């Protein structure tokens, strides 16, 4: 049997691609999906051991969401350590395991993982969520402490809202646990102090939430000279990841103490759009990496974002935290991910629909003009530079773009609105969501898209990070378009591996 190879390079016709069950760069196990990442830095192995919850499409009704461990060292390569902590019985309090934290004790050479057990169909007198602990001697085998049950209602907190234990050790030598719970109708991040991680004292309330919202997966850390609190908003209308800044821990606590609204920056602490959730950070001592999950779309439709809140779990995504001189935080591509792309692919124009002109590597586009490039591959890195006429232009990058493509999915960088918008173009012209960022004063944009199969992350001049789930984007042409202003694109480079 002689195999036939189609002319992939030379055609711009839309092609029905498919996603493999496994992912390499943005990790996804061959079985199940990643949810709620729990990063951790191993002081012994000097690597990153990120755990998560193994979600499935047909989740069992009672017991589900086990914990699976993933070892990495750079954020690009990932190996799987298998199931670490298994879900309990139907009647056990830990039938479903929620997000947790991990901390190493040199005192007894033990890894302690504090997770949240969810009672299946809890009764009136039964706490819905209880914090539990599992100990490991070598991070491989885990034994759950059956004598530890940190009930939320013991300290006057809500029974049904007691989640996300985050553990951190300060310089004074005492470990602090933050729990995102509810008190008398108000969202409170409560602090528990310990000296041996076996007995805890509730040291009041660490912080209060902003405008009766809920914070998911709190993460307090220190980056040089500021204290940062990364959290995920549980509100259906927001469903995003924000952060708070503070020179000291006291200043961070005083931030939003009572409807203060001390936003860290002018974009209300935005980091990424709707396609990034449960962002939790870990540092190896030289760099800080945040892990989250890009959600999947029901029916494999990029425009089917879904009502209220999107689908749970998805692909593990790792980004690098960048701290500016003013204390603001921005997300950047990991160095290993950037350097993994080695081979370079020649790029050439496919379609000439607009009034654009070509002068070599430079393409000048007016309003209503667009240019279509050649096909992409499974893993793509598209880097280019766009100079706009002024600070009120609307250019855009469109994927799943073909000669006969009825609809394509676009990211429009609107300088007049000062943000970017992920929308669906074509016969539907549907608006999906957006993300605010800082507009450069020189009208210069350095656009770098890193795409693995169907998950793509766009970086704009180290100021905007935009995660997207775009199915069928691999092995399909991509295009640049302009709608209102005048743009000039250059240095277009496509790298694959």
């Amino acid at each position: 049997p002689i195999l036939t190879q189609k002319n992939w390079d030379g055609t711009a016709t839309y092609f029905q691609s498919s996603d493999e069950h496994g992912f390499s760069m943005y990790y996804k196990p061959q079985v199940g999906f990643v949810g709620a990442p729990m990063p951790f830095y191993d002081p012994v192995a000097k690597d990153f051991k990120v755990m998560y919850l193994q979600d499935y499409r047909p989740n069992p009704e009672a017991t589900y969401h086990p914990i699976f461990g993933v070892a990495t060292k750079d954020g690009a390569t990932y190996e799987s350590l298998g199931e670490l902590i298994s879900c309990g019985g139907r009647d056990e309090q830990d039938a479903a395991i929620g997000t947790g934290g991990t901390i190493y004790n040199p005192a007894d050479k033990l890894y302690y993982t504090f997770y949240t057990g969810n009672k299946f169909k809890p009764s009136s007198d039964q706490n819905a969520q209880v914090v539990m602990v599992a100990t490991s001697p070598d991070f491989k085998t885990w034994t759950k402490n059956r004598t530890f049950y940190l009930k939320g209602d013991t300290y006057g907190y809500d029974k049904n809202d007691f989640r996300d234990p985050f553990l951190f050790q300060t310089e004074d030598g005492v470990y602090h646990m933050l729990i995102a719970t509810r008190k008398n109708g108000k969202g409170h991040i409560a602090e528990f102090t310990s000296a041996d991680l076996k007995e805890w004292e509730s040291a009041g309330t660490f912080m209060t939430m902003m405008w009766d919202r809920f914070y998911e997966c709190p993460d307090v850390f220190k980056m040089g000279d500021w204290w940062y609190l990364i959290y995920s908003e549980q509100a259906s209308f927001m469903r995003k990841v924000q952060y708070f800044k503070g020179r000291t821990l006291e200043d961070l606590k005083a931030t939003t103490a009572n409807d203060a609204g001390i936003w860290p920056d002018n974009r209300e602490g935005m980091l990424d759009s709707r396609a990034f959730y449960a962002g939790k950070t870990a540092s190896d001592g030289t760099n800080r990496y945040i892990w989250g999950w890009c959600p999947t779309r029901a029916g494999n439709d990029n425009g089917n974002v879904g009502d209220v809140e999107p689908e749970w779990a998805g692909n593990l995504v790792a980004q690098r935290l960048i701290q500016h001189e003013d204390g603001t935080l921005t997300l950047g591509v990991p160095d290993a991910i950037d350097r993994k792309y080695t081979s370079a692919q020649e790029v050439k124009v496919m379609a000439k629909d607009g009034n654009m002109i070509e002068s070599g590597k430079t393409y000048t586009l007016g309003e209503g003009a667009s240019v279509i490039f050649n096909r992409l591959k499974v893993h793509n890195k598209i880097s280019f530079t766009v100079k706009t006429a002024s600070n009120t232009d609307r250019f855009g990058i469109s994927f799943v773009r073909g000669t006969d493509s009825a609809s394509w999915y676009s990211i429009h960088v609107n300088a007049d609105e000062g943000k970017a918008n992920f929308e669906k173009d074509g016969d539907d012209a549907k608006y999906l969501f957006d993300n605010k960022f800082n507009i450069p004063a020189d009208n210069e944009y350095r656009v770098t898209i890193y795409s693995d199969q169907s998950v793509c992350v766009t970086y704009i001049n180290d100021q905007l990070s935009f995660t997207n789930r775009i199915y069928q984007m691999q092995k399909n042409p991509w295009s640049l378009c302009c709608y209102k202003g005048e743009i000039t694109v250059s240095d277009v480079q496509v790298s694959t591996y």
């Binding site: 049997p1 195999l3 036939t4 190879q5 189609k6 092609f15 029905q16 691609s17 498919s18 493999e20």
Partner: protein
């Protein structure tokens, strides 16, 4: 050795394929009991191979690849041919008696 061939047949019999053809093609002009089916050109070993092959329902990695007989670009009913012939090339026998 022998060769069998059907020369005429009622239209309903040829359609229902009781004597051969599986109800897809008429057995007239072919051996009695001959069957019509697809052609399996190995199995898919990579997503690149799956994409390169002509589109077909349920194609995936590790699945049977079916040849496109008419080169229409899609695997369907018309991509079937004569694959079975229940006629031996030759049948032989040997008897040895030593006293």
């Amino acid at each position: 050795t022998y060769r069998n061939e059907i020369l005429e047949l009622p239209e309903t019999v040829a359609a229902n394929g009781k004597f051969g053809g599986n109800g897809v093609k008429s057995v007239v002009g072919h051996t009695y009991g001959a069957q019509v089916g697809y052609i399996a050109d190995g199995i898919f070993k990579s997503q690149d191979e799956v994409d390169n092959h002509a589109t077909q329902e349920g194609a995936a990695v590790g699945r049977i690849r079916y040849r496109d007989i008419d080169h229409n670009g899609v695997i369907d009913e018309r991509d079937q041919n004569w694959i079975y012939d229940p006629t031996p090339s030759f049948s032989y026998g040997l008897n040895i008696y030593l006293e």
